[PDB]
Design a protein around this ligand. Structure first.
Ligand code: ZN
Ligand code: ZN
Ligand code: ZN
Ligand code: ZN
Lengths: 113, 111
């Protein structure tokens, strides 16, 4: 009695403090974690939508390059490999076996005359 | 010793508190381990999606290449060509032909 009731009071004080603190962690975390789990779900999709377009633009670039490089070359009317023999307008061949194969089909169109 | 029992009760309470905080920070850590796993499996599916769209677009690339091989193209402006000059050299019209002549002159193999 005296010292004992004084230190009981100290234990009551300490326990009451721990309750206040835990009431603050609990009141704050239900809200704070609500905002952290949607903040990271959105930053992921903003990064993904910037990625799909990054590659669409890239391939659209590579396409136009490939198409333009194709404009600078003659191509075999038979097999679409690059050609080196000329027959008539818009008709070339990689070699005479392609020309000789294509000839039944090409004869109806050949303008070499 | 009543006094001693109380102060011990105090130390055992504060030790329970450290266990408390350590339980929290271990859940804090398991939330992050599951969190970072999320972006990983999501990025994995995202990259498998990207793969299929690359596949589609390379198919279109090859289709445009193949269509381009079936036509003559202006050596000057890459519009479709109409007038023939010589091997691999064709023009959409006389302006292009003559605009190109200063350079093409040395390569013209006109027969
Ligand atoms: Zn061929
Ligand atoms: Zn022909
Ligand atoms: Zn032109
Ligand atoms: Zn020429």
């Amino acid at each position: 009695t005296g010292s004992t009731i004084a230190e009981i009071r100290r234990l009551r004080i300490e326990i009451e403090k721990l309750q206040w603190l835990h009431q603050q962690e609990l009141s704050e975390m239900k809200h704070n974690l609500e905002l952290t789990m949607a903040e990271m779900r959105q930053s992921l999709e903003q990064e993904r939508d910037r990625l799909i377009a990054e590659v669409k633009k890239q391939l659209e670039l590579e396409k136009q390059q490939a198409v333009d490089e194709t404009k600078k070359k003659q191509w075999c009317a038979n097999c679409k490999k690059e050609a080196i023999f000329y027959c008539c307008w818009n008709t070339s061949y990689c070699d005479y076996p392609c020309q000789q194969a294509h000839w039944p089909e090409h004869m109806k169109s050949c303008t070499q005359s």
